[PDB]
Design a binder for this molecule. Structure first.
Ligand SMILES: O=c1ccn([C@@H]2O[C@H](COP(=O)(O)OP(=O)(O)O[C@H]3O[C@H](CO)[C@@H](O)[C@H](O)[C@H]3O)[C@@H](O)[C@H]2O)c(=O)[nH]1
Ligand SMILES: Nc1ncnc2c1ncn2[C@@H]1O[C@H](CO)[C@@H](O)[C@@H]1O
Ligand SMILES: [Mg+2]
Length: 295
């Protein structure tokens, strides 16, 4: 009724158990909450789901074919009855404040809250987020249009007004950055009021020919998405120009068989945020920082 948790899942029955248990330890009245698990035509997870359902109002949906996270999430958005929807990937965990920390902002007039993200390089549980080897923390406020440049959060961090009621769904033609496209669909396409909640955190758990072709899917979907959704300030429209620069440097390294920094994208976001801010750096300066971020 109040909140629908949507968990797309695929061949990770055991991570899905951790995510569900992190819903069960929510500091929240469970009579107001439903959970929708969507098996994207992988190994069955009935016994995993029938276990948690002894406490949560849980629904298991079985896809007719492997549809990608877009098609699986959409299946959840279609039946989610909550005024509000909270996405949770099957390999991530909520903190117990995930809803008590976001719902007051939504009831107050927000349409879309994202919380802080801890990039967890060790597996954790919901009540033990702050016992993990935290590699990076994504905590960028919404004051600069960073989200217009490229994505800086993840669906496990998002609680938002019923997208089925807005008629806003995931694009099934995108297997990567389908979330970036969806966030802009809500914020621009449907004028959702985006608000950052920095007092709540999730734990997000995260070959050359292999790598070059992989990042190329990302750049090409990033161009697609940029073209579909123009930036809502001129500075952000200018700072998009440094993304193909960052890609070119990534490709250069990959071709020389040199590895990039572990979280070079997340170091890149910090450079792009800087470039969007009060004293504006010259492009040669950003370029030098994109270097360090990637080295
Ligand atoms: O065919 C698939 C693959 C995955 N999933 C589920 O989708 C979620 C995300 O999959 P995962 O492999 O964990 O994604 P990440 O690599 O962590 O992130 C991807 O999905 C993110 C949102 O989770 C986007 O931010 C990024 O573009 C993209 O890299 C999880 O619930 C998966 O179980 C499906 O339902 N179907
Ligand atoms: N604009 C973009 N948005 C999201 N991801 C992007 C991206 N450009 C590349 N990537 C690639 O996807 C992974 C990011 O964590 C990593 O594989 C790599 O950084
Ligand atoms: Mg993941």
């Amino acid at each position: 009724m109040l909140v629908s948790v949507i968990i797309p899942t695929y061949n990770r029955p055991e991570r899905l158990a951790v995510a569900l248990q992190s819903v069960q330890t929510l500091d929240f009245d469970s009579e107001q909450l439903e959970v929708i698990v969507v098996n994207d035509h992988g190994t069955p997870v009935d016994d995993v789901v029938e276990a948690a359902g002894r406490s949560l109002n849980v629904r298991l949906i079985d896809q007719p074919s492997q549809s990608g996270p877009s098609g699986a999430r959409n299946a959840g958005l279609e039946v989610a009855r909550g005024e509000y929807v909270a996405f949770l990937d099957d390999d991530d965990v909520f903190s117990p404040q995930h809803l008590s920390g976001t719902l007051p902002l939504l009831k107050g007039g927000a349409d879309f809250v994202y919380v802080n993200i801890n990039i967890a390089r060790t597996r954790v549980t919901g009540t033990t987020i702050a016992d993990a080897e935290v590699l990076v923390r994504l905590e960028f406020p919404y004051d600069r249009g960073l989200l217009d440049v490229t994505n800086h959060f993840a669906p496990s961090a998002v609680v938002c007004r019923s997208p089925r009621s807005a008629g806003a769904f995931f694009d099934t033609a995108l297997g990567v950055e389908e979330d970036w496209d969806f966030f802009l669909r809500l914020a621009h396409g449907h004028k959702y009021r985006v608000v950052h909640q920095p007092e709540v955190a999730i734990a997000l758990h995260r070959p050359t020919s292999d790598d070059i072709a992989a990042l190329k899917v990302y750049e090409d979907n990033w161009h697609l998405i940029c073209e579909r959704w123009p930036a809502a300030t001129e500075r952000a429209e200018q700072v998009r120009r440094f993304m193909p620069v960052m890609y070119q440097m990534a490709y250069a390294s990959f071709e020389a068989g040199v590895p990039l920094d572990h979280h070079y994208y997340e170091r890149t976001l910090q450079v792009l945020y800087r470039a969007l801010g009060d004293p504006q750096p010259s492009p040669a300066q950003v370029e030098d920082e994109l270097r360090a971020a990637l080295e």
